[PDB]
Each structure stands twice: as C-alpha cells, then as structure tokens.
Amino acid sequence: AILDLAKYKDSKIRVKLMGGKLVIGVLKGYDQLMNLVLDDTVEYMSNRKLGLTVIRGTILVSLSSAEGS
Amino acid sequence: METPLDLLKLNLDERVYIKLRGARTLVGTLQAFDSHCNIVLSDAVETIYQLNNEELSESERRCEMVFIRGDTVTLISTP
Amino acid sequence: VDRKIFVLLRDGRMLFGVLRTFDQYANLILQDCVERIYFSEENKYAEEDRGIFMIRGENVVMLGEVDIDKEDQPLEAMERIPFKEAWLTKQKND
Amino acid sequence: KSGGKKFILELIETVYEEILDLEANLRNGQQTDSTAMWEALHIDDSSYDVNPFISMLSFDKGIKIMPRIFNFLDKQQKLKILQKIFNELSHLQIIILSSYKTTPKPTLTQLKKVDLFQMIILKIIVSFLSNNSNFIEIMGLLLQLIRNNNVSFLTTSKIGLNLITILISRAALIKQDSSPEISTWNEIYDKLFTSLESKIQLIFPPREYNDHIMRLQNMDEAYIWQFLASLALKLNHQRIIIDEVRDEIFATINEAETLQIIYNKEKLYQDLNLFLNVM
Amino acid sequence: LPLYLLTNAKGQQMQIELKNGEIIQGILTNVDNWMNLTLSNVTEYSEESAIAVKLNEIYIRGTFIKFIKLQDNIIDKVKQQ
Amino acid sequence: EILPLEVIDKTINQKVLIVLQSNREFEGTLVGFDDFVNVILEDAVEWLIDPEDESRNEKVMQHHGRMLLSGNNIAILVPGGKK
Amino acid sequence: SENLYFQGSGSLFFSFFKTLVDQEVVVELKNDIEIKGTLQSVDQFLNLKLDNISCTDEKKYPHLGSVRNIFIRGSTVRYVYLNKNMVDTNLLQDATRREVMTER
Amino acid sequence: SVTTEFLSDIIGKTVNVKLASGLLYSGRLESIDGFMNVALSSATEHYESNNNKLLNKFNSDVFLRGTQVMYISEQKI
Ligand SMILES: [Co+2]
Ligand SMILES: [Co+2]
C-alpha cells in the first residue's frame, strides 16, 4: 500500500474517525486494510479512556503522530 | 417467503405506501422498481412532515407520474 | 472538453472555473476557481479565489456552462461586501 | 378475498409470470405449455369458498390480463372459464360494486374499476359468444347463471344486468334457420321471469345513488332500457314488463319536465325510444 | 485519471479539506492509486479557525477528501494573462 | 504477529463492547462475526452516550436473545466490555 | 416478445429514461431545487443532462442568466416528475416482472 | 457463516429492527434479503424504545431497506 505502519509501533497514535470521533493510543498491530489494534486508548468527544481497542480501517479518515501519549 | 423484493413485486398495480428518511412519506399506485429500490409511482400523493416553531404541520403534493430515487426510501407497505 | 462552467456543491457553496479531466464519475479538476456567494435580498455578494481545484465526485450536485461576461453586469449594480460577512451571514441563513 | 390477498396476489402474479414466459416463447419454443399456466387459474379447483379465479378477477391487474390469457386458451377451456364466471357470478367483487344494494356510495375509483371490467371482460364474453359458441352451450351458460344465484340481485348491478342482456340477446339473435332446443329455451325463459316478475323496477336505481354518481361527474340508463328491450324481444310476459315499469316510463317521460347550455335531452328520449321501438 | 494528475503535482505544498470540515495544509510527499496522500509538512485546522495544531506529519485516506486546493501554476497563470 | 480479526476472534464468548460512529454503543456477549464484520451479540445492553456528562448517557434498552448489528456503522470494538 | 423498457438484467431504469430522451421533464433534487428542462441523455448511474432549462428561483439560489444546459449528478436527485402520456404502464410493469424473474 | 446461520433460524421469530434514523420497528421477521432488506408482518413503530409513544402501527407486511438497518434483535421481552 501507501503508508508503511511498521514505523509507528508503540508510538503515540492519533486517529480521526468518520463519525467525528478521534482516538489516541499506542500501535500494537494491523491488517492489510488498515484495521488497527490500539492499546492505552483515549477517545475524544465531538459535538474517556477505555484503553484496549480494535479500529475498523473502513472508518479511518486520518492518522498521525501525537506528542500526547 | 421470497426475498422482500418479491413481496414488493406482489404490489404492482396496487396502492403502495413509501417512507423516506427526510420526514416525507408517499402513498400511491406502484408501477415499477429495481433492486436499488428506485421507484415509479402512478397516482401518488406526497405528504411532508415538518418542525415549525414548536408545531407539527403537514403539507402535501400530488402528481400524475413521478420517478423517485431509491436511496431515499426507508420503508414500504400497503396504504 | 475545455470549458468555463459553474458548479454547485452539496454543502451549498458555489465554485466557478474552467474544467478539465472530468465526469468519469463527474469528479472535476478546475483552474482559476472562484467561490461566489450571493444575497439578492440585500443587493450584495462576495468572492475569494481558488487556483487549481480537485473535486471528489460524491460532492458535486450539478454543473453547467456559463458565459461569465453576460453575468457580470448584474454583478456590477451590486455592492461587493467582505467575504467574512458572507460566510457568517450564510451560516445564519443556513 | 377469503384467501390472504397475499395468496391471491401470488396467484395473479404467477399467472402474470407464466403468461410472460408463454409470450416469451414466441421466439420459437414449445409454445403451448398452457397446460402449465392453466393449473394456476384454479378454475377446476373447487377447494375454496370462492374460486381463486373469481377472487383475482376482483383485482385490477386480473381483469387487465384476461385478454392475453384467453389467447393461449382452447375453447372448453375458454368455455370452462366463462362457465366459472357465471356459476359464481354473485361472488364477483365487481358484481357487488355495481349493485346499489351492497355498495350504495362507490368511490370514483370503484366506478372506474366497474368501467374497466366492463370494457375488457364483456368484450371477451361478447366475442367468445359470437365466433365460438354453440346454441346449446349458450343455454348451458345461461342456465348456470340462473340456478346458482339470487337473480334480480344481479339486475341492480350494471355488470350483471348487462351480462344478462348479453346472454339473452345473443341467444335470441339466433333467429337463423337450423327443436328440443327451442323447447328448452322456453323453459329457461319462463324460469328466469318468475324471480324478476315481482321484482322488476327494482332494477332502476335509487335516487340518492344517481345523485351520488351525478355529483362525481356530469345518468346514462340506456343499459337498463337496452335490457328491458332485450328481455321483451311470451305475450303475457310482455304485459307484466310494461306494467311494473310503466310508471317509471311515465316518470321518465315526465322526467322530460323541461323544454328550453344546449342541454342534451335527446339522450334520455333515445334510451326509452330504443326500448319502445323494439317492443 | 485524477490521481494521476495529482501525482504530477507531487512535492508541492497545498491546502486540503476533508469531508468533515477539517482543513489540512501541508507539503505533499507521495500519492497512490487510491488517492492516498503522504502530507509531509502538516498543520491542521477548521474553516472557522482559518477564516490550529501542527504535527509535522499526517496520514490521510483518499476516499474521505471532499476537495483539495493546489497552488497557482506560475507559468500557466502568466500564459493565461 | 497480532492481527485485528484474531484479537477480536479471541474475544468470542467473552463480554465485548461495540461502539458505532455516532454516539451509541451496545455491550453484550459476542457470539460471532464474518468477513464483512457483521457482529452477533447476546443479551445486549444498548446505550446512547452524552459526550459531556457520563451522568447524562442514556440506557435505551436491555436486549435479550441474540442480536445482529450491521457492520456498516461499527467504529470501535472493545474486548472485556467497557469496564 | 421483447419490449423497450427491457434490455438486460440490471439496466431497467436506464432503459426507462432512455425512453424519455428528448422529452420535457422536471427534476427535483434532494436539496429541494426544481429544474424544468428537456432530457438530452442519461447514463447507467442515472445522471441527467438537461437542455434548455426553465426554473423557480430560490433562497439558496443565484440565477445564472447564461445557463441553458445542466449536468446533474444522479445521486443527488429526489424526484423526476413525469406526465402519464409518456409511459406505457402495462409495459413498465411487464418488463419489471421480467427483470425480477431474471434478477432472482 | 455465523451471520447467515443467524438469519436462517430467526425466520418467524418476533424481532426489533432499528434503522439508522433511530426508528424502531417490531413484528415477525420473514425475509432477510441478505442485503439485509427485511420483511415484517404485524409491524409496530416506536422512536427509540418500546416505552415510547406508538407513532405508527402497520396492519399488513412492511418492507424495510437493508441500507438503513442498524440492528436486528429478538424481542424476547
Ligand atoms: Co329515472
Ligand atoms: Co419534497
């Protein structure tokens, strides 16, 4: 694909989602389709930490590094 | 027992009721449809439900022949 | 397929420009775009320039060829107001 | 619709399917697979309170698909269907709607549906009884209508009353040459009259009815007079008819209580004149 | 075809708006067949703020872009005039 | 190598919390899923969520039996169930 | 026995609109905009190009005097209004039943 | 194939089908098009909960768009 995700392993993950949601956490794993496994995850309120999650790639709208985690 | 479309095909030449997402409902006599739920109605009367300044109001239109794009359709049943 | 057109988008904003490489899905690439906002109720309007615009096809509602010059003169008798005012007004209107 | 109307819609769409292939088999195919379509009409099947064909004959698309379905049919199948219509004629949900007795105020739509069944099914029955009939089979059809229904109930229905007119008229229109048949006809004719004899002029519709229809458009009663002319054309018989309807003739002739829009008074006189010219 | 054209506009800075009104302004570093973007020097904000956070880098999924404004081609603009 | 469907696989018959794109989530025991990530939950609790006040989140139904949640709208899957 | 409202499995409304080409229709969009015009073509996604339009001005609407022809993205249409003369309703139901016959 | 197996053995049971509009329809499930179009007989309509105002009751079969189905669940209670 286009972005090699190996580089962010156990690095802060900041993740925007289709419905307005934003999620941050450390990368643990992935699939070819950018389904993601995140640990230590905090989700953001748009008009809160639960830690462990699995995010659907289909719903991903943007991803970047965060100083936050 | 057939897929829901077949039941819809059972209604051809009959009065059908169609519900749209945007607070609009139609009732009329069905003439055609595809699997995308695009529809041709032959003597329909549309009715629109609104929110005006804390009161519910309903204006309505009728027309002889109208194609109606399926992706707006939320439900179908008999008048 | 090198024409000057207007486009109205799903969010309600109007873009104007000259098209290229468009319509396989109707996805469009425009040059020298202009976003124009009208309020006929106050004889005002507003502009801001858009150089090269790429548009994803699910966001276009409709488009069509225009003659810019014929549409200008009406432009003339109206007061161009600041773009900022129009954006704030528009959110008020919508 | 004693059945579900889920059921009858199934049926009516199955017949629509089957006749859609049989028509589609004209790119060459073994065309007469009508043995597969007929079984869907349930004509033979007396497994219900009302025969499923008579039921789907109530729906609009049923009546609309009758000319096409008759195309792939074989007289004695065509005759089997026409016998089914007559034998259960009082079960037709469009006999009900033409009757003023049962459906006193019929929505404009229901008036329309009556007009449709009229234009399509009568054409079929008037045609089949012209280019495809035996005198004795006309006897059979007629006799069937009599023995299985509350005759004169039907005389209130535009459809039934018109139907009766068709049976009789086409029958008596066999004045051409070429015995016991003649003997049989007398017997039926006498048998029909009795039921009507007391109840003729129950035919003519109540005033409110006419008022309700009249409000929905513009009453053409030419179908009533055409009937009375048909039944007349049995001398004492002629007397009884001209008796119970006399005052209605006296009222209708008095009906022309107006002389001098360009109102079409010609129409009303023509109907009664069509009766009297006949007999 | 659109992806192909953008891939020639590769390496230049631009201001891209997403489907939800977020604006991402940055330097395009790579593009793919699915209209994926690298976004090498990024600043991210809303239309409300433009008319507010920098992170140096962002990854964006192609199917979620509403539109993208690219910078005026200097030679093409002068040729037009 | 940990793969998302495999982590999720390891959650079958455990409590799981399923969050949509909108402000809605369903907690219940996860029975199974497919390729299109349609998820089956058993005896699911349905919540609406207030972004601002955990007190004003609203519990809309306790479901009983199995329910199928269409994978169109699934945003987030949480193994262990929203402790 | 093949009719005009019927070309193949998944092209029903496409053939239906192709039947309405060169006829005057009115198209209403999901955002309430109504456009009167003459149909010049359709595609498999039912996008419409209307020639020689006439219109009802609008709150959100700025009117471009030079515009005679518009392209319309199919996915943004709510209604396409017609007159009963333009369509054989028996045939439109028939070809529909044939398609359902096939599509199952 | 757990999902296809689920629709099989729920034909005939009473269910709750909530659409994306948040509207909730209950009655008996007999179609499961697999685009998840649903047909239901005896369908009632509530806004989000069985506890709310009945908005519409249907006396014949209802057809529901698969593209709009959010969930389907048995109404055991
Ligand atoms: Co009179
Ligand atoms: Co409307």
Coordinates of N, CA and C in Angstrom, one line a residue, chain E:
Chain E
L1 N -7.4 8.7 -13.4 CA -7.0 9.9 -14.1 C -6.8 11.1 -13.1
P2 N -7.7 11.3 -12.2 CA -7.5 12.4 -11.2 C -6.2 12.1 -10.4
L3 N -6.1 10.9 -9.9 CA -4.9 10.5 -9.0 C -3.6 10.8 -9.8
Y4 N -3.7 10.4 -11.1 CA -2.5 10.5 -12.0 C -2.1 12.0 -12.1
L5 N -3.1 12.9 -12.3 CA -2.8 14.3 -12.4 C -2.2 14.8 -11.1
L6 N -2.7 14.5 -10.0 CA -2.3 15.0 -8.7 C -0.8 14.5 -8.5
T7 N -0.5 13.3 -8.9 CA 0.8 12.7 -8.7 C 1.9 13.4 -9.5
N8 N 1.5 14.3 -10.4 CA 2.4 15.2 -11.1 C 2.6 16.5 -10.3
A9 N 1.6 16.8 -9.4 CA 1.6 18.0 -8.6 C 2.3 17.7 -7.3
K10 N 2.8 16.4 -7.2 CA 3.6 15.9 -6.1 C 4.8 16.7 -5.8
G11 N 5.1 16.8 -4.4 CA 6.2 17.6 -3.9 C 5.9 19.1 -3.6
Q12 N 4.7 19.6 -4.0 CA 4.4 21.0 -3.8 C 3.5 21.1 -2.5
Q13 N 3.5 22.3 -1.9 CA 2.6 22.4 -0.7 C 1.2 22.8 -1.2
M14 N 0.2 22.4 -0.4 CA -1.2 22.6 -0.6 C -2.1 22.6 0.6
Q15 N -3.3 23.1 0.4 CA -4.3 23.1 1.5 C -5.5 22.3 1.1
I16 N -5.6 21.1 1.8 CA -6.6 20.1 1.6 C -7.7 20.1 2.7
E17 N -9.0 20.2 2.2 CA -10.1 20.0 3.1 C -10.8 18.6 3.0
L18 N -11.0 18.0 4.2 CA -11.7 16.7 4.4 C -13.2 16.9 4.5
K19 N -13.9 15.7 4.4 CA -15.4 15.6 4.4 C -16.1 16.2 5.6
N20 N -15.4 16.3 6.7 CA -16.0 16.9 8.0 C -15.7 18.3 8.3
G21 N -15.0 19.0 7.4 CA -14.7 20.4 7.5 C -13.3 20.7 8.1
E22 N -12.6 19.6 8.4 CA -11.2 19.9 8.9 C -10.4 20.2 7.7
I23 N -9.5 21.2 7.8 CA -8.6 21.6 6.7 C -7.2 21.1 7.1
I24 N -6.5 20.4 6.2 CA -5.2 20.1 6.4 C -4.3 20.7 5.3
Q25 N -3.4 21.6 5.8 CA -2.5 22.3 4.9 C -1.0 21.7 5.1
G26 N -0.4 21.3 4.0 CA 0.9 20.7 4.2 C 1.7 20.5 2.9
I27 N 2.8 19.8 2.9 CA 3.6 19.5 1.7 C 3.4 18.1 1.3
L28 N 2.8 17.9 0.1 CA 2.5 16.6 -0.5 C 3.8 15.9 -0.7
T29 N 4.0 14.7 -0.2 CA 5.2 13.9 -0.5 C 5.1 12.7 -1.3
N30 N 3.9 12.1 -1.2 CA 3.5 10.9 -2.1 C 2.0 10.6 -2.2
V31 N 1.7 10.0 -3.3 CA 0.3 9.7 -3.7 C 0.2 8.2 -4.2
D32 N -0.9 7.6 -4.0 CA -1.2 6.3 -4.5 C -2.5 6.1 -5.3
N33 N -2.7 4.9 -5.9 CA -3.8 4.5 -6.7 C -5.2 4.8 -6.1
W34 N -5.2 4.9 -4.8 CA -6.5 5.0 -4.1 C -6.7 6.5 -3.6
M35 N -5.8 7.4 -4.1 CA -5.8 8.8 -3.8 C -5.4 9.1 -2.4
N36 N -4.6 8.2 -1.8 CA -3.9 8.3 -0.6 C -2.8 9.4 -0.7
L37 N -2.6 10.1 0.4 CA -1.6 11.2 0.4 C -0.6 11.0 1.6
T38 N 0.7 11.3 1.3 CA 1.7 11.4 2.4 C 1.7 12.6 3.3
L39 N 1.5 13.8 2.8 CA 1.3 15.0 3.7 C 2.6 15.1 4.6
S40 N 3.7 15.5 4.0 CA 5.0 15.7 4.7 C 5.2 16.8 5.7
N41 N 4.6 18.0 5.5 CA 4.7 19.1 6.5 C 3.4 19.7 7.0
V42 N 2.7 19.0 7.9 CA 1.3 19.4 8.1 C 0.9 20.3 9.3
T43 N -0.1 21.1 9.1 CA -0.8 22.0 10.0 C -2.3 21.6 9.8
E44 N -3.0 21.5 10.9 CA -4.4 21.1 10.7 C -5.4 22.0 11.4
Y45 N -6.5 22.3 10.7 CA -7.4 23.3 11.3 C -8.8 23.2 10.7
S46 N -9.7 24.0 11.2 CA -11.1 24.1 10.7 C -11.3 25.4 9.9
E47 N -12.3 25.4 9.0 CA -12.7 26.6 8.3 C -13.0 27.8 9.3
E48 N -13.6 27.5 10.4 CA -13.9 28.6 11.4 C -12.6 29.2 11.9
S49 N -11.5 28.4 12.0 CA -10.3 28.9 12.5 C -9.5 29.6 11.4
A50 N -9.5 29.1 10.2 CA -8.9 29.6 9.1 C -9.4 31.0 8.7
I51 N -10.7 31.2 8.8 CA -11.3 32.5 8.5 C -11.7 33.3 9.8
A52 N -5.7 24.3 14.0 CA -4.9 25.2 14.8 C -3.8 24.4 15.5
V53 N -3.4 23.3 15.0 CA -2.3 22.5 15.5 C -1.4 21.9 14.5
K54 N -0.1 21.9 14.7 CA 0.9 21.5 13.8 C 1.5 20.2 14.4
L55 N 1.7 19.2 13.5 CA 2.3 18.0 14.0 C 3.5 17.4 13.1
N56 N 3.8 18.2 12.1 CA 5.0 17.8 11.2 C 4.6 16.8 10.1
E57 N 3.7 15.9 10.5 CA 3.3 14.8 9.6 C 1.9 14.3 9.9
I58 N 1.2 13.9 8.8 CA -0.1 13.2 8.8 C -0.4 12.1 7.7
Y59 N -1.1 11.1 8.0 CA -1.6 10.1 7.0 C -3.1 10.3 6.7
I60 N -3.4 10.4 5.4 CA -4.8 10.6 5.1 C -5.4 9.6 4.1
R61 N -6.6 9.1 4.3 CA -7.3 8.1 3.5 C -8.0 8.8 2.3
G62 N -7.6 8.5 1.1 CA -8.2 9.1 -0.1 C -9.7 9.3 -0.3
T63 N -10.5 8.3 0.1 CA -12.0 8.3 -0.1 C -12.8 9.3 0.8
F64 N -12.1 9.9 1.8 CA -12.7 10.9 2.7 C -12.4 12.4 2.4
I65 N -11.7 12.7 1.3 CA -11.4 14.0 0.9 C -12.6 14.6 0.2
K66 N -13.0 15.8 0.6 CA -14.0 16.5 -0.2 C -13.4 17.2 -1.3
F67 N -12.5 18.1 -1.1 CA -11.8 18.7 -2.2 C -10.4 19.2 -1.7
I68 N -9.5 19.5 -2.7 CA -8.2 19.9 -2.4 C -7.7 21.1 -3.2
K69 N -7.4 22.3 -2.5 CA -6.9 23.4 -3.3 C -5.4 23.4 -3.6
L70 N -4.9 23.3 -4.8 CA -3.5 23.3 -5.1 C -3.0 24.7 -5.5
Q71 N -1.8 25.0 -5.2 CA -1.2 26.4 -5.6 C -1.1 26.7 -7.1
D72 N -1.4 28.0 -7.4 CA -1.4 28.5 -8.8 C -0.2 28.1 -9.6
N73 N -0.3 27.5 -10.7 CA 0.9 27.2 -11.5 C 1.4 28.5 -12.1
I74 N 2.6 29.0 -11.7 CA 3.0 30.4 -12.0 C 3.1 30.6 -13.5
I75 N 3.7 29.7 -14.3 CA 3.9 29.8 -15.7 C 2.6 29.7 -16.5
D76 N 1.7 28.9 -16.0 CA 0.4 28.6 -16.6 C -0.5 29.9 -16.4
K77 N -0.4 30.5 -15.2 CA -1.2 31.7 -14.9 C -0.8 32.9 -15.8
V78 N 0.5 33.1 -16.0 CA 1.0 34.2 -16.8 C 0.7 33.9 -18.3
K79 N 0.7 32.7 -18.7 CA 0.3 32.3 -20.1 C -1.1 32.7 -20.3
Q80 N -1.9 32.5 -19.2 CA -3.4 32.8 -19.3 C -3.6 34.3 -19.5
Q81 N -2.8 35.1 -18.7 CA -2.9 36.5 -18.8 C -2.2 37.0 -20.1

